[PDB]
């Protein structure tokens, strides 16, 4: 999994070298940033449910057809709505994994790999999940560098869907 620390080791291991100051400086930056990253992960976790519930509605309001249109890919049934809230929660949970791990690795491995294939096969529009992420970014209530961490990984998701 791609974290600042596994990148440091990967770099050294690729060249057949012991670690050096070059790499330890990189891990120190991960350890220092961790303060702001944890603060964000803890806040997003504590407010996860209202953020998922809020994000799901932002989608249904932006894209009303997804609640009235017939089809197993839409949220026009109780099951559809459940699947959607489920997916939004998956995205939110991956953001907190990235904050805790200090990199994109968790989202890369668990969500982004295969994403475009899944969205095509099941006829899921990326516009939906972008809007859900855009809503979380606006209403997570984070300030300072904690917001910068959170937005960096939410915007990372958004670029994967664009």
């Amino acid at each position: 999994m791609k974290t600042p620390i596994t990148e440091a080791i990967a770099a050294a291991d690729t060249q057949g070298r012991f670690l050096s100051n070059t790499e330890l400086q990189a891990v120190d930056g991960r350890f220092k940033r961790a303060v702001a990253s944890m603060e964000a992960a803890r806040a997003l976790t504590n407010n996860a449910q209202s953020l998922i519930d809020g994000a799901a509605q932002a989608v249904y309001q932006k894209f009303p057809y997804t609640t009235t249109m017939q089809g197993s890919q839409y949220a026009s049934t109780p099951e559809g709505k459940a699947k959607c809230a489920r997916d939004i929660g998956y995205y939110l949970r991956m953001v907190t994994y990235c904050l805790v791990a200090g990199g994109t690795g968790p989202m890369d491995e668990y969500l982004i790999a295969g994403l475009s294939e899944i969205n095509s096969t099941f006829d899921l529009s990326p516009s939906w999940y972008i809007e859900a992420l855009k809503y979380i970014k606006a209403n997570h209530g984070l300030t300072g560098q904690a917001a910068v961490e959170a937005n960096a990984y939410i915007d990372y998701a958004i670029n994967a869907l664009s």
Binding site: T6, A10, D13, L19, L24, T45, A48, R93, V100, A101
Partner: protein, 172 residues
């Protein structure tokens, strides 16, 4: 490859769960001990060559049949191969110290290494002795109270010992 942080992440994901407070607090204390972890890696790494050389010099003193004609470490080709294996093991151990997790050492060093020495005729029991020597030397160096901010690194030295023992147990 997993570090201490990715390890927790991968366990929560298998359960489909956000992290609990017990996990956010445990991962915060790793960070708060990060300086000590970097001192240990830096110290062991800055003395890699003396750790290895002195360990070999002692190994061959105690087991002189490894360097007698016919011995597994006789000729410069096999001696160099032996010194290299000791360098490699130490290198992957220092990787594990930085990551807070043994996966890099397991996946990229120790896995299959017992079978390798068996197919070559190399006595892994002697390789374990070598790894034991490096361990005592690395811990003595990394926990040297001199020229550093005083503090308690005992839990870290237990962890560092754990990796050396793990490698030593995997070859014997």
């Amino acid at each position: 490859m997993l570090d201490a942080f990715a390890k927790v992440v991968a366990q929560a994901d298998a359960r489909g769960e956000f992290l609990t407070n017990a996990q956010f607090d445990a991962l915060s204390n790793l960070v708060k001990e990060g300086n000590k972890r970097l001192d240990a890696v830096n110290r062991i790494t800055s003395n890699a060559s003396t750790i290895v050389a002195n360990a070999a010099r002692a190994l061959f003193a105690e087991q002189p049949q490894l360097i007698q004609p016919g011995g597994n470490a006789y000729t410069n080709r096999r001696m160099a191969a032996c010194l290299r294996d000791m360098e490699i093991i130490l290198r992957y151990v220092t990787y594990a110290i930085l990551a807070g997790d043994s996966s890099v050492l397991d996946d990229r060093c120790l896995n299959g290494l017992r079978e390798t020495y068996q197919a070559l005729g190399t006595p892994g029991s002697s390789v374990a002795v070598a790894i034991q020597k490096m361990k005592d030397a690395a811990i003595a160096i990394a926990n040297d109270p001199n020229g550093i901010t005083p503090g308690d690194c005992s839990a870290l030295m237990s962890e560092i010992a754990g990796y050396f023992d793990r490698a030593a147990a995997a070859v014997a």
